[PDB]
């Protein structure tokens, strides 16, 4: 029986999974998660999987900072006096969860100005029998960064907005293209999301 | 942005580095003086590495390459001005009576031999019964 290591939180849209490297030979795993001054909630008991879901706990309070640890129960059984374990990096979901790849909802050229709507993807954070939209969790902290260009020779002309809508003038000479990128400027890491699927008219 | 029927044409910023996508050469071809071209070129690829406020203490930023160069000011060591040390051990010679060890801008005081210092640093006191 050996301790786990390389514990990491693979989270996107608050879908948090804790994963560890060493393979379970004659060994099973169990993971507990708790806040700074909370109660150690145990999950994924005796499982041989090298990963465990933790979304249903961080969804309770995304703003708190969470600490987790993974024991290693010898296969067959408890331990002698204490299981052998290893902690995990402290994960505050609000400042760390990766933003999902945004999708463009619609785009229309009213007059000479285009109107690039952005679809609002939902997150794993729950409420009264419904998932919370991305805007419903971040609000003012969520801005966007559109890139538009001529189909040939690219030429990204960046633009910014604080809404799921856009209103930008064009030359009425060539079908522009769009690629949005949900940006949270109030973070320090994972600030910018991956670029949206390209959409052109 | 070396499109057809170009180069021999007069230079232009927008028509090259914004409409389409100009290269570095097409950059200087428009701006001549290299420094000013950098003034744009460090923005074109490396969007802006200091649009946040990483370097504290009102750290002005030039934002060149993606390495995020920032200007730090006096009274604060480090590039981000984050080191909040009082520049030396010279302040009251380390809040003391004689001097302070300058162990990499730390605060570790000492007195003279036979004049043992306190744990944190205060007036020197005789060590034995007849110092």
């Amino acid at each position: 029986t050996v301790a786990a290591y390389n514990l990491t939180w693979k989270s996107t849209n608050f879908k948090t999974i804790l994963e560890w490297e060493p393979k379970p030979v004659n060994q099973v795993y169990t993971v507990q998660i708790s806040t700074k001054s909370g109660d150690w909630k145990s999950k994924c008991f005796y499982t041989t999987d090298t990963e465990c879901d933790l979304t249903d706990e961080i969804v309770k309070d995304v703003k708190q900072t969470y600490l987790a640890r993974v024991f290693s129960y010898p296969a067959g059984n408890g331990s002698a006096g204490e299981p052998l374990y290893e902690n995990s990096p402290e994960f505050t979901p609000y400042l760390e969860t990766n933003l999902g790849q945004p999708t463009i909802q619609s785009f229309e050229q009213v007059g000479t100005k285009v109107n690039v709507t952005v679809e609002d993807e939902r997150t794993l954070v729950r409420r009264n029998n419904t998932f919370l939209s991305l805007r419903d969790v971040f609000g003012k902290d969520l801005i966007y960064t559109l890139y538009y260009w001529k189909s040939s020779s690219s030429g990204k002309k960046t633009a910014k907005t604080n809404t799921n809508e856009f209103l930008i003038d064009v030359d009425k000479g060539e079908n522009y293209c769009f690629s949005v990128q949900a940006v949270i400027p109030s973070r320090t890491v994972n600030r910018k999301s991956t670029d949206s699927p390209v959409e052109c008219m | 942005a070396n499109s057809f029927l170009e180069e021999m044409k007069k230079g232009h910023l927008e028509r090259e580095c914004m409409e389409e996508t100009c290269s570095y050469e097409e950059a200087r071809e428009v701006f001549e003086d290299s420094d000013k071209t950098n003034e744009f070129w460090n923005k074109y690829k490396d969007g802006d590495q200091c649009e946040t406020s990483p370097c504290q203490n009102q750290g002005k930023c030039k934002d060149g390459l993606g390495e995020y160069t920032c200007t730090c000011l006096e009274g604060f060591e480090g590039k981000n001005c984050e080191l909040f040390t009082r520049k030396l051990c010279s302040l009251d010679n380390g809040d003391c009576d004689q001097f302070c060890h300058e162990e990499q801008n730390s605060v570790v005081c000492s007195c003279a031999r036979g004049y043992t210092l306190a744990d944190n640093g205060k007036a020197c006191i005789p060590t034995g019964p007849y110092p």
Partner: antibody
Amino acid sequence: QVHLQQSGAELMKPGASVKISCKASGYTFITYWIEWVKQRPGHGLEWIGDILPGSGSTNYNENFKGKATFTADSSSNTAYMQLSSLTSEDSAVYYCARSGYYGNSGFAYWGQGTLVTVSA
Amino acid sequence: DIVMTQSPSSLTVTAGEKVTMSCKSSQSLLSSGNQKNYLTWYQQIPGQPPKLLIYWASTRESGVPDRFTGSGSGTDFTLTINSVQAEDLAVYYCQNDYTYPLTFGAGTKLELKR
């Protein structure tokens, strides 16, 4: 529960600079916007600007550019606000606040309020 | 910048009936992405910090009594107090909670008619 213990009341001469503090307790300090609201009597409320601790991002009101500066040290879980070159217009009651939970949900928890007076 | 216009500067009411308030806004606060109106109400009894009343212009903060109620959409917003008690005597402030910079209203004094 939670509380925001601001500093005491001050009486500065004109041209001086006050340093209001606001200690946060009961919640995760680095994951909530710490606001600042100025309330001169007979003028209602007037948002000054906020800082997100840890990240350090700030959003100053334009009419308070230079006048108000927000710093934050997360080790002690207290914010700081500094008003420079005080005048008779700075004699007001300032507050700090903590943003709500589900995004742009107001200022859930307010400080007790700090009275600042400037006069010759 | 958004300007907010509390229509009653100072309204009086006998304790017991229903009151209604208005808080206009220059730019509409309705975000079309999720159909929420991002304005916050506040209650401030004099000498006390302003307790939050309603966020998103319709949702009661945990602890707010069940008589305060927000309504309206777009640019016109309304706060309703039913069966006014002696504790309701305060100045209420609406807030732009959509776009930086955040701007507060002019307030609305509440008086006990006699």
